[PDB]
Structure formats: structure tokens, C-alpha cells
């Protein structure tokens, strides 16, 4: 049977406080609690007693009525609190077959407050909480008689998401404690985080009662997720963070990764006590509430020998000062070094960071009772018969409409769900000097606005490395792929030189005739090239033609001027003039071809290459045949025969030109470059050249007979030499033309050489004779 702290009065209000630590494993079936607590256990009791005294000394609030209390121990455990709630309701239970409790303040954990709320709402007892902030307790369909003076966990989740977004931590780890406080907060956090491109490596959970062995596997897994995810979000209580710090000291992982906490570990110095080195740099969020000053004056003057309202105080004196009282009823002879008479409670004093909420809850209950009393019987000052006994439903209705001013000077009022507004503060556990650590206020979150001071966090732009699974590789050509683990984790590879980037997740190849640009976004380049005059190699060939053309003029100079030579006089001048003009046309053919082979120029070029060789060779055949026939005869007949012969070549050229129209065409040899060539078919050049083959063979056939009878000097073997040289040139040109890609310089050189040998070979004997 546990003890209870009671104060008499006309109206009794219950309270659940966690004076002792919760039972450990192997001691939970007996419900055997641990050691005393100061901030969470005893300061709460003293503050409630003093608040009730202050209210009873106030004539404005509830005049002519005194308020009592009955404070029990919840031990932060659900079964113990259920037992104490049964102790509350036993009076009503036996009356259905000691003044009844009209309301309960506490407890401070969501998972216990739910069962307390169920059992209390079974009997119409309103309940007001000061530290239970789970989101699922704001459902008045299920928890009708529950109110709280603090906001829910949605704002905490939003603040955490805002912080991780601001610091660009896109790949974190998550851990929460068991019970609906951890679960609801963690699920809300991940639901919000999934929509801003934040990925979670893994999510874990653990009990606060878990042993040392159970806390080592958690740290082992967290380490296994290193070095990418070095930021850990924590919806954990103080004991869970304490166990994590102890585990990381045990395995020697101090400073390996930062951890982000919630109001469970807000400013409490016992969470990081003896383990400050393992927790430096952590960031926590806490509720905003200033220190109550009139509580400190009452608290710091308390002594064990004059306090007759708290047994836990007499235990707490010995526990805190590590001594045993001399002859007190609660000596606890375990300790030595008996307590001194100069031990004050004001040394190393730190106040609970949630005292104002408790005081505000007590004042809310008092004001609700005052309003209910005023409404039921207006003109009476005291407990009238209209409020004997007190209806739970009327009190609940009155409490929902209460608004007043708190200890901090703000205004407390409940919404439709029984919650109350509030804001947050951002802390940062750091090291201030040598062997001195402290929590420092950094920023704030209020109504969706987060303002944080980043100059005093990391002290420079070289902050923690952003916890990212994959580093960005936007090189302009690098293409990303996701293996299938998490979208945040990716690997990227370079693309082909022909391919151009379409987006991050695709890579496309450009079409023919174009090459990707510098940015690889588009591809339209590689214009055509001609190099008609900018190429040194053809230019020299032009010189080979140029002077050669001048040489032709020399052949015209002597022959036109001189006619008295018997050899020249006997030979027909028309044939010589025709062949000289043909040679000149052949020389001009390459000059026409080289420069800008456009549509009009190509048409003349195709005709020219097959025109000049045909007529000049035809004339030679006629001259030799006439001499052979002698060994009709009129020179007019020879000209007519030559004209008839060349008209066949002209007709063939015209027919070939009609079949294949001349036009400009684009040629793509390879992907590297694209050129422009005329639309010249293979047959279009095979057919005219083959025509001269019969013409060339005619001279060879006629040459054998003419060699027998040499007359008028002339040149017999020179015709055979010209035929042999032409055949050799053609045989050399055949394979290179079909093999070489250009097929232009080769043709120019071959035609120039043919013209040169044709002019030189059969004309220099006549020049020597003239000279």
C-alpha cells in the first residue's frame, strides 16, 4: 500500500506525479519502482501544495470555499497509475452500493494518460494534463473528458522537418521510443518528410526499460548505416537518449554522428550528466515557458525537520545529499557521513522546465470550479444546495469555456479539441569552456515561422557534412540511374559522345548530320565543306594546268604564223586546229570543275570531261585511216566524217544528262563530317569513258599498218606511245577512283597528264622541224 499526500478542504482534487523511477525488467510484475526524482517528482508536489495554499488565501477566486488534494505516485508506469486511479474511484464504487474526487491533474506521459482517461471517463471525472502532447488524445469522440494546456505533436513534427530542410539533411536515420508518444510523432514526421525529398535510411524503436544489451544492437545498426546517414531524428524520452549516450560511450563512438531530439530531451541536465562529451552538438526543441519566481522562494527554504506534508521529502533529502539523518524516523542507514546542519537546498539548484504548465493546469481547474459555482447559484457565497454534489458533466462544460491569464502573463483558453496554443525554442548542447557544457538558445519556431541563428551554430560555414546518400553529378553529360533501394541513393555514368542529354533519367542519341553542342541540350552543327580554293593540294594541280594552257597557246602561235612547211601544208590545218581547241577545252575542264561545283557548273563539268577527249581522239583516227587507205580524199569529207563521229558522242552525253538531272546533293561519308557532291551516277561516267575505248583501239589498229610506209616525215610510233600512255593512265586511275573517297584530285591529275602527253608527244617533232 503506497503512501499519499493529502490536504483537507471542501473540494478534493487528485494528482498523479512520477516521484520514483519506473520499475525495471525482472521487477515490473511486482510494480516495484526505483529511486526518487527531484524535477519530475517532488518539485511538482511542493508546487501543487503551495498553489493550493495561494488559491485558498485569495478572496477573489472561490471565496468561502477551501480546496484539498490527494497526490499519489504514478512512477511513469501504466499499471501503478491504473492502481492509483482505482484508489481514486473506490469511493464512488463503494458509494454506488471520504469526499469524492472532482478532477485529476496529470499524468505526464501519453501512454499512461490514455488508460487513466478511460477509467476516469467511465465515472465522469474531467482530467487536465500539462505534458501529454500526443496527437491522438485530441479526439473527443474517444477521450471526451481530457484537456491539456499544451499543443500537440504536429507542430513539433513541423519544426523538426523545417530544421532538417533548412540544413539540407536529405538522408537521415530515425528512432523513437515505444508508446503512442513515439509512434505518432515518428509517423507524422515521416509523413511530412516524404513530401520534400527527404529520405530515411532506417527506422527503429526501443523501450526505455531495455537493458544494456538491447541498447548495443541499436547503436551497431546505426553505425552500420554510417558514414552516409550521420543525423538521427529522435522521438525519444530522456531515458532513451541517456541509454544511447551510455551505449556510445561503451563502444567508443563519441562524435561520430549528430542527433536531433524533441521535448523529451529538451533541457534536462540528467540526460547528459557524466556523458557530455558524447552529446556535444545535439539540437533539441522545447516548449516555451519562463521560470516561475515565487515558487523558488518557497522551495529553497524547505528543511526536512519542519516539512510535515511530504514523506518523499525526507527520503529525498538523504538521497540528494548522500547522507543519513541523525535520528529521524526515516534514517535510511545505508549512507554514511551523517547529514550536516548547514546543507541548503539552494546549491546547484535548477528548476523544472515545465513548472508553469502544472501551475496553469491547477489554476484552470480552480477557475472552472469558480465559474461553475457562479453559474449554478449566483447570489450565494459558498457551497449551495444546487451544487451538492458536483456534477461532472456541468464541470466539464464549464471547463471548456474557461479563459484566464497564466503565471507568464499570457492568456490560456481551450479550443474545440481542448488544446491550448504555444510556441517552441531551439536549443544546442555545446561546450562553453574547459570541462563546461551548457544548452544555448539558438532559434525559435512559431506558427509556421522558423527563425534560427546559424552564426553561433558551427561558428562558420564549415558545418557538418550534409548527410546525403549520393553526391550530385550534373556535369552536363552524366546520366543518373537508381538501383532500387531509395530514390535518394543513385549512381551515375557518362553518356556517349554521339548521345545528347534529354533529362537526368534518360540519354538520347542525336540524328545523322548533327553533333551535340557544348551543353549537350541540342544538336545542329557540322556544316558542309568544299575547300575549292582553300586546299593547297588542288591549287598546285591548277598550276600544272595553268602553264600547260599557256603551252597550248605556243602550239597555236607557230602553226598559225607558219604555213610554208611542206609537212604542215600537206597535213590538214582544220584537224590540227580542232585537236588544239579540244586540248584547250580539256585543260579548262579542270578549272571549271575545281571551283564551286554547283548545279549549273556540274552539268557543264559532266559534259566537258566526256567532250574534249572524244573529238580530239576521233580526228587522229580519221587522219591515220586516210593515209592507210591511200597506201572521199577531199579535206571536206574528213571534216564531215569527224563531225558525224563527234555528234555520236554529243548525243550520248545529251542522253546521259537527260536521264540523270544535274543538281546539288549532300554526301555523308561518316558521322565525323558531311560534305556536298554532285549527283553523278557510276554509270553516268562509265558509259562516256567506255565510248573512247573503241576510239582509242581504232588508232592502235590503224597504227600497225601506217608503220610500214613512212612518208612526209610525220610520227608513226608516237601514236602508239600516246595510246600506251593513255592506257597506263586509265589503268592507274581505275582502282584509285573507286577506292578513294575524294575522286576529284585524281581525275584532275589524270586528265591534265593525258592532255599534256597528247599535246607534247605528237607535236614536238613538227616544232623541231619548224625550228
Amino acid at each position, epitope marked *: *500500500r503506497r*503512501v499519499v499526500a493529502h490536504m483537507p478542504g471542501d473540494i478534493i482534487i487528485g494528482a498523479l506525479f512520477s516521484v520514483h523511477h519506473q520499475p525495471t525488467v525482472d521487477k515490473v510484475h511486482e510494480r516495484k519502482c526505483g529511486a526518487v526524482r527531484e524535477q519530475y517528482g517532488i518539485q511538482r508536489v511542493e508546487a501543487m501544495l503551495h498553489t493550493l495554499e495561494r488559491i485558498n488565501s485569495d478572496p477573489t477566486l472561490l471565496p468561502n470555499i477551501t480546496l484539498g488534494c490527494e497526490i499519489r505516485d504514478s512512477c511513469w508506469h501504466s499499471a501503478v497509475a491504473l492502481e492509483q486511479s482505482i484508489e481514486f474511484i473506490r469511493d464512488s464504487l463503494i458509494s454506488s452500493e471520504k469526499k469524492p474526487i472532482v478532477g485529476v491533474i496529470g499524468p505526464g506521459s501519453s501512454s499512461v494518460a490514455i488508460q487513466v482517461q478511460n477509467l476516469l471517463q467511465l465515472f465522469n471525472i474531467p482530467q487536465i494534463a500539462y505534458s501529454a502532447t500526443s496527437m491522438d488524445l485530441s479526439d473527443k469522440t474517444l477521450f471526451k473528458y481530457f484537456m491539456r494546456v499544451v499543443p500537440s505533436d504536429a507542430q513539433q513534427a513541423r519544426a523538426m522537418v523545417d530544421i532538417v530542410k533548412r540544413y539540407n539533411w536529405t538522408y537521415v536515420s530515425a528512432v523513437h521510443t515505444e508508446g503512442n508518444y513515439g509512434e505518432s510523432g515518428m509517423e507524422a514526421f515521416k509523413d511530412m518528410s516524404a513530401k520534400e525529398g527527404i529520405c530515411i535510411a532506417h527506422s527503429y524503436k526501443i523501450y526505455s526499460n531495455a537493458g544494456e544489451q538491447s541498447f548495443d544492437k541499436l547503436l551497431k545498426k546505426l553505425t552500420s548505416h554510417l558514414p552516409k546517414a550521420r543525423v538521427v531524428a529522435c522521438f525519444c524520452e530522456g531515458m532513451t537518449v541517456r541509454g544511447l549516450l551510455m551505449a556510445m560511450r561503451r563502444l567508443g563512438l563519441a562524435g561520430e554522428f549528430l542527433l536531433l531530439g524533441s521535448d523529451g530531451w529538451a533541457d534536462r541536465y540528467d540526460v547528459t550528466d557524466g556523458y557530455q562529451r558524447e552529446a556535444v552538438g545535439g539540437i533539441t526543441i522545447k516548449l516555451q515557458s519562463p521560470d516561475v519566481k515565487w515558487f523558488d522562494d518557497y522551495y529553497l527554504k524547505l528543511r526536512p*525537520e519542519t*516539512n*510535515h506534508r511530504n*514523506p518523499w521529502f*525526507q527520503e529525498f533529502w538523504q538521497h540528494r545529499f548522500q547522507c543519513r*539523518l*541523525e*535520528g*529521524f*524516523p*526515516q*534514517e*535510511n*542507514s545505508k549512507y554514511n557521513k551523517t547529514c550536516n546542519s548547514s546543507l541548503t537546498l539552494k546549491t546547484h539548484h535548477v528548476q523544472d522546465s515545465k513548472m508553469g504548465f502544472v501551475i496553469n493546469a491547477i489554476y484552470s481547474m480552480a477557475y472552472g470550479l469558480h465559474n461553475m459555482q457562479m453559474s449554478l447559484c449566483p447570489g450565494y457565497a459558498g457551497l449551495c444546495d444546487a451544487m451538492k454534489p458536483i456534477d461532472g458533466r456541468k464541470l466539464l462544460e464549464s471547463l471548456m469555456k474557461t479563459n484566464f491569464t497564466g503565471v507568464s502573463g499570457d492568456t490560456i483558453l481551450f479550443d474545440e479539441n481542448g488544446d491550448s496554443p504555444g510556441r517552441y525554442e531551439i536549443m544546442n548542447f555545446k561546450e562553453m569552456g574547459k570541462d563546461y557544457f551548457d544548452y544555448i538558445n539558438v532559434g525559435s519556431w512559431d506558427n509556421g515561422e522558423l527563425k534560427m541563428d546559424d552564426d553561433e551554430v558551427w561558428s562558420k560555414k564549415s558545418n557538418i557534412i550534409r548527410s546525403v546518400c549520393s553526391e550530385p553529378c550534373e556535369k552536363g553529360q552524366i546520366k543518373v540511374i537508381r538501383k532500387g533501394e531509395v530514390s535518394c541513393c543513385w549512381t551515375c555514368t557518362p553518356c556517349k559522345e554521339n548521345e545528347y542529354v534529354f533529362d537526368e533519367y534518360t540519354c538520347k542519341a542525336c540524328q545523322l548530320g548533327s553533333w551535340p553542342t557544348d551543353d549537350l541540350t541540342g544538336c545542329d552543327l557540322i556544316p558542309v565543306q568544299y575547300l575549292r580554293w582553300g586546299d593547297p593540294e588542288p591549287i598546285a594541280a591548277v598550276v600544272f594546268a595553268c602553264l600547260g594552257l599557256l603551252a597550248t597557246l605556243f602550239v597555236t602561235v607557230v602553226f598559225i604564223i607558219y604555213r610554208d612547211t611542206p609537212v604542215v601544208k600537206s597535213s590538214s590545218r582544220e584537224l590540227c586546229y580542232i585537236i588544239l581547241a579540244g586540248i584547250c577545252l580539256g585543260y579548262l575542264c579542270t578549272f571549271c570543275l575545281i571551283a564551286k561545283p554547283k548545279q549549273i557548273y556540274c552539268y557543264l563539268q559532266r559534259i566537258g570531261i566526256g567532250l574534249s577527249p572524244a573529238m580530239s581522239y576521233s580526228a587522229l583516227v580519221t587522219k591515220t585511216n586516210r593515209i592507210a587507205r591511200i597506201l572521199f580524199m577531199s579535206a571536206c569529207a574528213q571534216l564531215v566524217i569527224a563531225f558525224i563521229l563527234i555528234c555520236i558522242q554529243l548525243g550520248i552525253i545529251v542522253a546521259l544528262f537527260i536521264m540523270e538531272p544535274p543538281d546539288i546533293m549532300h554526301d555523308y561519308p561518316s558521322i565525323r563530317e558531311v560534305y556536298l557532291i554532285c549527283n553523278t551516277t557510276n554509270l553516268g561516267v562509265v558509259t562516256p569513258l567506255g565510248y573512247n575505248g573503241l576510239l582509242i583501239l581504232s588508232c592502235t589498229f590503224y597504227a600497225f599498218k601506217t608503220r610500214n610506209v613512212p612518208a612526209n616525215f610525220n610520227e608513226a610510233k608516237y601514236i602508239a606511245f600516246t595510246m600506251y600512255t593513255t592506257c597506263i593512265i586509265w589503268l592507274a586511275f581505275v582502282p584509285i577512283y573507286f577506292g578513294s573517297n575524294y575522286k576529284i584530285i585524281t581525275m584532275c591529275f589524270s586528265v591534265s597528264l593525258s592532255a599534256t602527253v597528247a599535246l607534247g608527244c605528237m607535236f614536238v617533232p613538227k616544232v623541231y622541224i619548224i625550228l
Partner: nanobody
Framework: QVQLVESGGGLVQAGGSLRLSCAAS????????MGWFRQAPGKERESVAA????????HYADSVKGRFTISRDNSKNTVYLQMNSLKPEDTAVYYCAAAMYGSRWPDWEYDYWGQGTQVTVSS
């Protein structure tokens, strides 16, 4: 509420021995330190012996130190006073009391008292 009943008294010759028992009801026995009182006719009441809420430490008056012993038993909720070497001046009524909110003995602020038991020593 806790009700205290003491027994074990009688007539004992000088130099004998006696054992007084004090039993308390309820279920909060372990949270109360206990003490014994002696009251003689024509005089006042004086404290005799006391024990803390969990044994451990016991305190005796200087008049009867070395002869009396005090003990607890939380399993069956009773305290014992074994008194030996009887003396003719010990004829008086003995009371058993409980306290929770005291100071250094013998200032203990008792709240529950027993009926009493007559003890007389025959010369």
C-alpha cells in the same frame, strides 16, 4: 487509520525477563517509525525506546540502556520490546506509538497511540 494493540504484560519477579508485543492494523505499517512510552502513577510519561521506519537504527533512553531491546517485523506487522533485568522502579503502564513526520529523537510528532499495558515487578 491504524489501530494499535499491545499485549504481553504480567507480573515478573526482580531480575527476570519479559517480552511486550505491539500489533498494528492496516497495510501501511512499514512507513511508520515506532516508539515505546512508560507512564507511572504520580508522574509523567517518558519515552523508552524507538526504531526507524525500516529497522536499521534503534534509540534507547539512558535509563534503560543495556537492558531493553526493540525489534520490528514487517512480515506480520508487529514490533517487540524484550526487557530483561527487571527493577522495582519499572512498575508502570506501557504504550506503543507510531510517527512519520518527526525530527531527531525524541522529537517525533506521533499520531497513533495504543491502549496501554500494565507491568509490575515483584520484589
Amino acid at each position: 487509520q491504524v489501530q494499535l494493540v499491545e499485549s504481553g504484560g504480567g507480573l515478573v519477579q526482580a531480575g527476570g525477563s519479559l517480552r511486550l508485543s505491539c500489533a498494528a492494523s492496516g497495510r501501511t505499517f512499514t512507513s511508520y517509525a515506532m516508539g515505546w512510552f512508560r507512564q507511572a502513577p504520580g508522574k509523567e510519561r517518558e519515552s523508552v525506546a524507538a526504531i526507524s521506519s525500516s529497522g536499521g537504527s534503534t534509540h534507547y533512553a539512558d535509563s534503560v540502556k543495556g537492558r531493553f531491546t526493540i525489534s520490528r517485523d514487517n512480515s506480520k506487522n508487529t514490533v517487540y520490546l524484550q526487557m530483561n533485568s527487571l527493577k522495582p522502579e519499572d512498575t508502570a503502564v506501557y504504550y506503543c506509538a507510531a510517527a512519520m513526520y518527526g525530527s531527531r529523537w525524541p522529537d517525533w510528532e506521533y499520531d497513533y497511540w495504543g491502549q496501554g499495558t500494565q507491568v509490575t515487578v515483584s520484589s
